[PDB]
Each structure stands twice: as C-alpha cells, then as structure tokens.
Amino acid sequence: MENFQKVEKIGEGTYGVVYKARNKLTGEVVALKKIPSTAIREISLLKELNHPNIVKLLDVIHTENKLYLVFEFLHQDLKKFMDASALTGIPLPLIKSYLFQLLQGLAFCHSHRVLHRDLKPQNLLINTEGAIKLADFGLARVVTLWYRAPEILLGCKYYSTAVDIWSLGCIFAEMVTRRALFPGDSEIDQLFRIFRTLGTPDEVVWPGVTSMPDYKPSFPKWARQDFSKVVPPLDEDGRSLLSQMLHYDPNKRISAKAALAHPFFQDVTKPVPHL
C-alpha cells in the first residue's frame, strides 16, 4: 500500500470503503477498496473475469491481515446520474443503451456461473464515452433491499442468475419513471411492495412458492397491476421486456442472453451522456 496515495472517499460500500487513489509506480488513478484462504482464491478468479461492461479488477493485495482490491476508476455512478437527470429524465435511447450494456455484462458473468447478487445504481459506473459498467461482480460469493429478488426475500438459499435480472429490471423501471420501483425499508415491506404491484404470488404463477422457507399462508392477497400503470410512458416493447425480467418464478424470468435478442433493442444506439 505504500505505492498508493488516497485522494478522496468515493463510497462506503457493502464489502468495504472505496477511495479514489493514485498509484505512484505508473501514475495510474484507481479505485482502492479496503476489505481467509477461500476469499483469496475466489477473488483471484475475478481478476480473469474481464469484460468491457465489468469494472476492471487490476490487483488483489493481501497485507497485514487486510485485503485491498485495486480497481479501475470511473467518475460517476448511475445513482448520481439519475439524481442529476430527475427533472428532465434520462433520454430513452440512453436508458436503452445502458440496459443493453448491463445485459451484455450480466450475460458474460452468468456464462461463467458468476452472479452479482447485489445490483443497484450505486454499483453501476458510467463514463463520458457512453459506457456503463458493473462493479463488485463476484464479491458476494443500511444495505438497500430495493432491488432484491423475491426468492431471496422468501428464503431461497440456492438462488440463481435470475436474481440479477430481477435487480436490473427494477433499475430499468427506475430509469424510466425517475422513482424507485420497490423502495422497501424492511424485508416484509419490500416483499409487500412487490406483491402490491405484481400481485401476491401463488402456486399458479410460481409453482413451489408456498413451500419456500419464509412464505406465509397469511400473506395478504393483492391483485396484480398492469405495467401500463407501473412504468408509463414506456412503450410496448419495453413493458414486455420488463415484465419478463420481473416474472416471479426465477425459471420463467428471461435470461440476459435472451433479453439481448428482445425487440426493444432493435434500434439500440450508444449515445454520449451529459455529465
């Protein structure tokens, strides 16, 4: 760590604090994250999980029982860009570009059996060229519950890649409407917000749901809402895609690879954002 000079704190993340830092032996500006043999080996697998839409893990430094991760630095996160764009809205072509790029990133991770597990606007980083990148991919193997898939909330311990599709669908809806889709402030508030919008799940729409660990037969039974009410003014292609990303049954939920082939992306482009 004597090779790095901290510049500024850029995040109080889930796995540790992140700093903007300067590498004295190359002049490189990086994101330095200050965090057992199992962890060293899993984190070393992530050094090879390289893709243009995944924030690059430059180095892993284990010293004095402390673990530091050296990452590529990007100047803004999607949380800030959404806040800066709240009065006007992110233009649809840019929403579409960001969603497309994030699906490419997830399709890549998922093809290597790597899950993110905690997608949220705070760990989606953007640059001036129009790129968006996923940060903290693989580290999971007040914390926000807003983007949590219902199977996690219902106690599934062996959840799948579908959890990341759910989170990304929540983020897509939030870019379009300029408001979080399900801003729960407890696990039950989170689950009940999901149920009030998408209907209380049952054995018809989600076979096996009633036998999940935290499922309660006493859950209130809410009727489902139309997506035309939930994400106006998103067009029919976008609503169709979103509905497939928010299917209750993780097995029915669209995969990242199938989402990339959805007609919503027929006219996708790569606009440059106003930062």
Ligand X SMILES: CC(=O)NS(=O)(=O)c1ccc(N/C=C2\C(=O)Nc3ccc4ncsc4c32)cc1
Joined tokens for residue 187: 């696990």
CA proximity to 267, closest of 226, 247, 238, 230 = 238
In angstroms, give the least distance from the CB of 80 to ligand X: 3
- Answer for which of 43, 46, 54, 55 binds ligand X (CB under 6 A) is 55
- 90 or 231: whose CB is closer to ligand X? 90
Residues 101-160 that bind ligand X (CB under 6 A): 123, 125, 135-136
Which of these segments, 5-13, 171-179, 222-230, 238-246, binds ligand X (CB under 6 A)? Answer: 5-13
Token couple for 59: 């180095």
Using CA atoms, how far apart are residues 152 and 203, in angstroms rounded to an integer? 17
Taking the complex as a whole, how short is the minimal distance between the CB of residue 267 and ligand X, in angstroms? 29
Q: Specify the residue, 3 or 14, whose C-beta has the smaller distance to ligand X.
A: 14
* 71 or 248: CB nearest ligand X: 71
Q: Give the one residue of 80, 196, 224, 270 binding ligand X; rule: CB under 6 A.
A: 80
User: Which residues are CB-contacts of 169 (< 8 A; sequence separation ≥ 6)?
Assistant: 242, 245, 246
HSE at residue 198, side-chain half, CA atoms within 13 A, is 24
DSSP state of 26: T
Is 76 among the residues that bind ligand X (CB under 6 A)? yes
CA distances from 128 to 77, 81, 270, 272, 273 (A): 12, 12, 11, 7, 7
CB of 84 to ligand X, least distance (A): 9
Active site residues: 118
**Interface residues with ligand X (CB under 6 A)?**
10-11, 13, 18, 31, 33, 55, 71-77, 80, 123, 125, 135-136
